[PDB]
Design a protein around this ligand. Structure first.
Ligand SMILES: *[C@@H]1O[C@H](CO)[C@@H](O[C@@H]2O[C@H](CO)[C@@H](O)[C@H](O)[C@H]2NC(C)=O)[C@H](O)[C@H]1NC(C)=O
Lengths: 49, 48, 49
């Protein structure tokens, strides 16, 4: 019942692969992956007077 | 005996035919397709 | 040619696990269990969940 291992899914690209396919054993290949990074945003406001 | 129709002249005829061997390969980013990077959408998608 | 013997065993088992896993989804309801929807809501709100 104890958590044995974990993966931070935004650290590098192997971690994005493991979290995008939701498994720890990944079976040699070439894979397309998703993004799990935060990347804090800004603001672009432009209205007329 | 019997009658047989035997050729006395000929040509060469060409039949054309297409056989498909492959399709276009596509991978989809499912998270960006469904939720467009919104955290409120991504918590509602865990229920499915 | 031996890897196709195992990929039929895996295909037989992947069909059965996609049946049992759709019973723990809530699909946007308050719970994945009918006996909990019947105990927390009233008769007009039970039918929508
Ligand atoms: C088989 O058929 C072809 C075509 O029907 C004949 O070729 C013709 O020959 C004459 C005389 O040489 C020419 O005037 C025509 O222009 C030819 N036609 C074509 C389309 O090439 C050929 O002679 C025939 N063979 C026999 C043994 O009868």
């Amino acid at each position: 019942g104890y958590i044995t291992k974990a993966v931070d899914c935004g650290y590098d690209d192997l971690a994005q692969l493991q979290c995008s396919y939701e498994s720890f054993e990944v079976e040699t290949g070439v894979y397309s992956v998703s993004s799990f990074e935060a990347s804090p945003r800004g603001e672009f406001i432009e209205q007329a007077t | 005996g019997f009658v047989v129709a035997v050729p006395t002249n000929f040509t060469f005829g060409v039949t054309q035919e297409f056989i498909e061997t492959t399709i276009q390969k596509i991978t989809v980013d499912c998270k960006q397709y469904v939720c467009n990077g919104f955290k409120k959408c991504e918590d509602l998608l865990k229920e499915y | 040619a031996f890897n196709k013997v195992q990929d039929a065993v895996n295909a037989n088992a992947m069909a059965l696990s996609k049946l049992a896993a759709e019973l723990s989804n809530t699909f946007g309801a308050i719970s994945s269990s009918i006996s909990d929807i019947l105990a927390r809501l009233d008769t007009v709100e039970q039918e929508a969940q």
